[PDB]
Amino acid sequence: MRVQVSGLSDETTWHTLKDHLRQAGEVTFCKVFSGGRAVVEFVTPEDAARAITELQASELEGATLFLR
């Protein structure tokens, strides 16, 4: 259930990323890296599956986000 996030704004923090992802499901782990990357773990596989299907190319703080 670890999902990789890419394309994030330099400004984006785990607070704004977790809030965005919560549309798909709750988050138990969230680490924001440099270069617009993050690693996230959802509570359930269902949450991860919805995130990876429903939030591709979604917009967050001006940036286009991708999940892997």
Author numbering: 202 to 269
Report text from the authors:
Kinetoplastid RNA (kRNA) editing takes place in the mitochondria of kinetoplastid protists and creates translatable mRNAs by uridine insertion/deletion. TbRGG2 is a 330 residue protein and contains two main domains, an N-terminal glycine (Gly)-rich region composed of GWG and RG repeats and a C-terminal RNA recognition motif (RRM). Unlike these editing accessory proteins, the T. bruceiRGG2 (TbRGG2) protein is required for editing all nine pan-edited mRNAs. TbRGG2 binds RNA and modulates RNA structure and these functionalities have been shown to be to be essential for its role in kRNA editing.
The structure was solved by molecular replacement and refined to final Rwork/Rfree values of 18.1%/22.9% to 1.95 Å resolution. Comparison of the RNA-bound RRM domains with that of the apo RRM structure shows no significant structural changes take place upon U4 RNA binding. The TbRGG2-RNA structure has a complex asymmetric unit. In each of these complexes two RRMs combine to simultaneously contact one RNA using a unique binding mode distinct from that observed in other RRM–RNA complexes. In addition to the RNA contacts from the Cys231 backbone and the side chains of Phe230 and Trp215, several basic residues either make contacts to the RNA phosphate backbone (Lys219) or are positioned to provide electrostatic contacts to the RNA, such as Lys230.
